[PDB]
Every structure is written in C-alpha cells, then in structure tokens.
Design a protein around this ligand. Sequence first.
Ligand code: HEM
Ligand code: HEM
Lengths: 451, 452
Amino acid sequence: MPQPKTFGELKNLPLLNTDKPVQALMKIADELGEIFKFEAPGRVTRYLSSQRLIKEACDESRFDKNLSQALKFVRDFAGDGLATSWTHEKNWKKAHNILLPSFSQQAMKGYHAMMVDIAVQLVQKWERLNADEHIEVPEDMTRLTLDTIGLCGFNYRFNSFYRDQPHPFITSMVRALDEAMNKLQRANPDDPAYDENKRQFQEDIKVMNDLVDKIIADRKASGEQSDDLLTHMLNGKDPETGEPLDDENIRYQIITFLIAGHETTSGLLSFALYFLVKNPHVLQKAAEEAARVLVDPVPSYKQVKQLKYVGMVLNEALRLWPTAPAFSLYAKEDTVLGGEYPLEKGDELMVLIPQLHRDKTIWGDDVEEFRPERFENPSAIPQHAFKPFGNGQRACIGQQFALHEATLVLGMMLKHFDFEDHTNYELDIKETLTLKPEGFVVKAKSKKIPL
Amino acid sequence: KEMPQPKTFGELKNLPLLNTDKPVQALMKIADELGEIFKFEAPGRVTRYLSSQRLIKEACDESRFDKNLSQALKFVRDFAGDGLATSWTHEKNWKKAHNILLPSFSQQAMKGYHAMMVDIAVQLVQKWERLNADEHIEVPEDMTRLTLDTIGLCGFNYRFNSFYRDQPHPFITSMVRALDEAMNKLQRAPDDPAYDENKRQFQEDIKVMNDLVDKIIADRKASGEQSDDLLTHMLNGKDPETGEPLDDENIRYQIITFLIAGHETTSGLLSFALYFLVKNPHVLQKAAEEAARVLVDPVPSYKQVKQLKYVGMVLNEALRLWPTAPAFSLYAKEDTVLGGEYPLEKGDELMVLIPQLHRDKTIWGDDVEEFRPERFENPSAIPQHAFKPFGNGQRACIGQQFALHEATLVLGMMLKHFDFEDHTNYELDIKETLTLKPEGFVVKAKSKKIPL
Ligand code: HEM
Ligand code: HEM
C-alpha cells in the first residue's frame, strides 16, 4: 500500500500539522491514488478515494462507523448524541428510532415556517445595507443556520442577526469546537501552557449544558407543545425498547444538532453562492427558476420542492466541497478490500469525500468544473459515488433538513438580489472540522421585490 | 387567452392537415403563421403544439407534465411492447428498466461499446475506400447500414452484416416494414379489406422480430457466455428499487426498442451533418482539420473521440436545425396554467415541436436558419430547455451518449479519411416517416489514402 513521507518516530503524523489538513490529504491522494496508509504513534488508518473501494467500505455487513479522533474529542461535549455514539451503544439505536420520523421529508412541512422566519431576517438584513457596503457570506450564513437550528430544535432564538458578538452559547460551542479541533495536532497536551485551554474547555461545556438543561426543564414545567424537535423528543418513545430518551441524552441531541448542522449547512450555502457568482450562466439559470417558482412574497413548502435546479446547484456544490469532508469506518471482521488489500478485524478506514467526488472513472475528465447538470437525473449517479451525507444507518439524519433550508434560502437570495463578485474573490478554504470559503464577500443589489 | 388554431375541415376539424407527406414541415409552417402555441383538433382528440422556449420550459416541468404516448408511439407499441420508449411512466416495467439500463447507457459505459462501434465504422470506411472512380455514396442508406449494425452488435452481439447485402437481414426488413405500417396507420382513413394484406404482413413481421430476438436471448441464457453488450447487462441486472430483474419478454422489447429508437434518428443525424458540411466548405475544412489533428492512430480510441470538440458542435448544430426525433408528447398531471394565459385541465395533451423550438429567435438570434456550429462553443450559455433533441427529464433519450459517441466517432473517421464533393449540387428534400432524413442525398468521396 502506498504511503506518504515520514518524520522518523512520528511517522506520517506531522503531515496533519497544517491549517488545511483535508486539502493536504487530497494532494497526497492525487500523488498516491485510491488508497494510502497513514501511520502515527499508536494508530494506523487508510485513506480511500475511489468509488471502487468506497462502495465496499460502505457495505454495512463488513464495516461499521468508527469515531475518528476528531469525533472522540467532540463527544466530550456532544456526549452520546447520534453523531458521537457508537452503533452498538443503546442510546444510538434508541435516539435513531425516535428521531428518524422527525427528520423525514414529510416532517419538513412542520419546520418550514420557522425556517422562513430566519430566512426573511437574512433577506431583510441585506435589503437594509447601504450602497458600497458588502456581505460577509459565511458569517451571515452561519448566523442563519445557527438561528434556524435553534428555533427548529428547541424553539430558542439566539438572535444572531441582532449581534456582533454571538449569544454566549454560540461562543462557547464555537470555542469548544476550536479546542477539540486544536487538540488533533497538539503535542505535549499535559504541558502547563494548556492548563488555561482545559479550564476554558470545562467552562464552555457548562455554558452549553446549563442553557440546554434549563430549556428542557422549562419546557417540561410549562407543558407547552411547539413544532420543534425538543417537543418530539419529550413525547417520543423508542418502538423497540418502549423507552423514551432521558433528559441528559435530549440535551446531547440538541447540542449535536447545532454542532453537526450549523457549519456544514452554512458552508454549503457559502460554497453554492461562490460557484454561482463564478459561473454567471449557471447563476442565470438558477435565478430564472427562483423567479419563476417563488411567485409569492413568502415561499411555501410546495414551492421549495419545485426548485429543482437550485437543488442541482447545491448537490454540485456538495460534490466539489462536501462540508463534512470525511468519515471513519472499522472492519467488523477480517476481510479483503478490493481483492488485494487484506484487513484485520478492527482495522480503520477514512473516506476522503472530496477525492471520492473527483473520481474520473465516475464523473469524467472535467471533475473540477461546476456543472449542476450532472444531477439533472439523480438515478444516473452510481451507488456510493456521491456521499456528502455519509453512509447507511449512520448517514446524516439531518439531510432533508439541511437541503430544505439551503434550497429555501438560496432560492430567496436568488429571487431578491443580483450578486456581484466585487473583489474577484480568490477561493481560500478554511478548515475547522468543516470547510468554508474564508473571506468570501459579495455585493448584493436588491431587485426591490417585497416580502 | 384565445388560442390560435389552423384552418378546419368541417367535421374532420384540423386532422386533414396531417394527411400530407411532410407533416412535421407542415406543422412548422403553421407555427410560423400562428406562433408559439396553436390548438389542433381531430375527431375525439385535442392537442396543443408548442414552439417557444418560454412555454416549453414549463412543459418540461415534470411536476406538472408527464410523457404521453402519441398515436405514433401507440402504433409502435404493438411491436415495441412495454420497452422504455413506448411504456408509460407509471408502468412497473418502465421504472424497472430505466433503473437497470441507465448505468449501461452512461458516458462512462461507452468505453465498453467503443470497440464494437469501431468494428462497424471500419467496415463503412472500407466500403468507401473500395469504390471505383466516379462512383458515389448514398449517404442515408449507408448511415442506416452503419447504425443498425452498430446497435445490433452493441445491443445483443448479433451481426446483421448490412454491408454485405443489398436486401437487408430479414429482421431489418420486417422491422422497417412494421415501422412503415405503424406510420402509414396515422393518416389511414382502416378496417377496409384493402388493408387485410397490411394486417397479415404486420403480424408476420412482428413474429419475425420476436422469434429472432427471443432465440438470441434463449441462446445466450443456454450458453451462459458474457459479452460487452446490453443483453448481458439485462440478463444479469437487478432493479435496486424492487430487487427484480427484467423478464425475457421485456428484454426482447428493449432490444427491439434500441433498434427502433436508435437506428433512424442516429443515421439521420449523420446524414444531415454531412449535408450541412458539404454545403458549408469553411465548416467542413475546420472539422477535417480537427479530425486530422486528433485521430493520430490508425483506429480511434475512446479518449480521442472525446477530443473531437468541433465535430461534437457540428452534430449539435445539425440536431438543432433538423432533430431526427422531431416531437414528443406530454399530458397535464393536474389542472395548471401554461404561460400565465392558457388554462389547462388535468389530462390535457401537449406536443413539443422540436424543430420550431430550435428556431426560437429569442434564444438563438436572428440567424436561426444558418448552420453555425460555433453556437455550441460554450454549452452553458444556452438557457434551460432551449435545446431538446433528446427529449426531457427522466423520459429523455437513454441512448443520447450512445448516439453522440457513435456519430462523433464515425463523422471523425469520415473526415479523416476522405474529401467529400457535393457532385450533384444536392437540393435538400426531407423525407418524413416517424423520423426525418435528407432523401436522395449523395456525395463523392476521394480517399486521402490514410491506412486503417
Ligand atoms: C448541509 C450540510 C450537512 C452535511 C454535509 C452533513 C454531513 C454529515 C455526515 C457526512 C455525517 C456522517 C458522519 C460520520 O459518518 O461520522 C452526518 C451525520 C449526522 N448529521 Fe449531518 N450534515 C449536514 C447537516 C446536518 C444537519 C442540518 C443536522 C441536524 C439538524 C445534522 C445532523 C447529523 C446527525 C445527528 C448525524 C449523526 C447521525 C447518526 O449517526 O445517527 N447534519 N452528517
Ligand atoms: C441520435 C439520434 C437520437 C435522437 C434524436 C433521439 C431522440 C429521442 C427522443 C426525443 C426521445 C424522447 C421521446 C419521447 O419523449 O416520446 C427518445 C427516447 C428514447 N430513445 Fe432516443 N434518440 C436518438 C438515439 C437513440 C439511440 C442510439 C438509442 C438506443 C441505443 C435510443 C433509445 C431511446 C429510448 C430507449 C428512449 C426511451 C427512454 C425512456 O422513455 O425511458 N435513442 N429519443
């Protein structure tokens, strides 16, 4: 098996001591091909980049979800929520069974009104900018996704569009994620210099726990019923065990929805708008659809489902830059991958999603071009070739939520404004646990269409 | 609001307007007079012909309209069965075959068919290399030999050997005669005893097609052999949705469908392409330059065919002016308003008149009748649903990649190996069956003496 350059006793690990580790791994995959071994002190994994091998890795009879070191550090504040739990933990299948109906396409009808609430705030903010002011795209998109998840999740308003400094919960969550991310490439973690990081980390965990535990307790005491996930979780029972989720796991699910959903979804909208302004003919196609479909001052659920080309735009943005760029697997038993790579029980795999989506044997030679028409007929796409939302029963439970919000928001943006890439922005992808175009700015000229 | 309508014939309404040898060209002329939409009434049937991108982009909204079987397709269904082209979207065998066959018709799947396409293409070039001085080429006749044999080879690994014959293989004769009868039934005013022979011949030709294809399927199952053809993919394929494979009868109908739907559309494309090339010597020279620059090997590779960008533009511009499957039919899934001024009731029918759509001046400019492949220099500039030679949506042509790879490879080789002369100063005469072709189109080919 191919393997990149080594650093003596540290093996390959210093290769990840960079601010853009996913893009670095993509370049290694370019050099070494569909699979390479990555060794560190006390850990071996294998990075997969081809549909040929990843379709086998996605065989749930042979491989199960593994917690990457990133996910392991996130579990310190995400607990045994869906994203940071092992498949064999009782609370995964319990929460999976309870929550799946509340994330279905049919369930999006009930969240649509709250999504419109925040989306109209975004449109109103941009309508109210002065001439030669500009938009900070990922910053506003993250304001929009956080508030939408907070509203649809537990009927709480972070009011991000009223602030320069976010609600203290958001600051603690972002800083907790940053510390979790920074721990990945941190040498000598027990050194006294990181004592402050550890103190701050425990403080931010309590901030998140205290607010969510308070809202859960408030909702139980009031007895009120809203259209949010918190109500569904307070009333839900696992059909298998007959048990409901307890209050602690409910808090972890709410924290998980915010962690897993806010930056992935905001990056998608940011990357979508980036590719649109860089491809004016595609923007014109998407803007025509939004104008033709969204004939009412406020979009309906039915109208959002009609934004077929906008949906294609989002899928192509997810192809080039999937904002949750990897997931991890382990072999359930000894098995042979691709007919030439023997794997022992417990061996770890990483799916490098941006490389998978550039597999020329699947997509052709023009993999770097932004062409939503690749997704004109979804059935043409081979199995396990397009995995922006993971795989199998451990796939993204929020996929329908994410695509419904992004389709609604991008449609409204394209309905109400013309956009100008006024700085000729040079793509610079910042890496946390997710991907986003850092510093992406545009000017928006209103079409003067009322809400 | 008030929809235009062409002249009427009393109780026969508009129907006698189609009792002509060139009905598509007649419909195009009516569209010139009446505009983007006109109603067409016949006893027991009303439809609406659309010609503008403005209205057709709404008709292509799959949430509002689904594919309808025209009377032409209904008559073809008598021997095409519930294959993809003559089945309703709601029939179980459509979605099943659609799911199974789509991967076998992808652009990537053309790599596996390329060798068999080259086999037939080399036979075509060899025939033209072997003509004597001042002999000429019957262009649509040879193109139809080329596409029939290519589909037979890639479809079920059977050689009709059309280039060894003046009278085609009996399957082809039966298929062509069945298609002619299906077409002739459209304007036949049917139970008269004069048509008794037509009915007997029709059932005989159906039996010929069914018996041969059923035999090849049975032979393949008994042998167990695996080829690079669609028949193998269909014998081993399973719909991911239902988990079911196609049964042997539907497989036979798919094979018959590939030959019906693909042979005349694709040969007409090649014939119209060569017509426009010899009528536009500067464009022919540009395409011949590309073929010489790209096809540096005695036999073209799949990779080289993809590099024939200008040849691809030539074919698309030929498809723009004369799309060889010139119309398709739709019905309204629910009550809807088309264009904001035409109310449609559930079940109402539409016809998309593709050659008129491709002459929409609001899309293409004022020179819509000029042959300029440079229109397709950047495909992304073309608005949505403005260029639809292969239909729309999930009911679009599944053979689009097959057809364009075939036409690009063959035209590339033709331009590499020969100079062409329009030696009769051929006057375009478009014969209409269910497809369009330049009847009597002939050329002389002077070999460049480049070996294969
Ligand atoms: C639009 C961008 C989004 C992307 C690209 C994305 C991607 C992913 C991926 C790749 C996984 C699997 C990770 C793994 O296997 O380790 C996952 C899981 C998950 N996602 Fe998302 N996601 C998005 C939005 C959301 C939203 C909006 C929510 C919540 C409302 C959400 C909640 C979750 C949860 C709970 C899981 C764990 C599911 C389980 O294992 O049971 N995600 N997501
Ligand atoms: C190059 C010229 C070709 C043209 C212009 C063309 C055009 C079309 C059009 C317009 C339709 C849609 C008809 C409707 O909506 O009723 C269609 C459907 C179809 N065509 Fe083609 N075609 C060509 C070549 C081929 C080839 C080479 C094949 C097979 C190898 C093929 C097989 C089919 C099939 C199976 C369908 C039905 C698809 C479905 O409804 O699922 N065609 N074609």
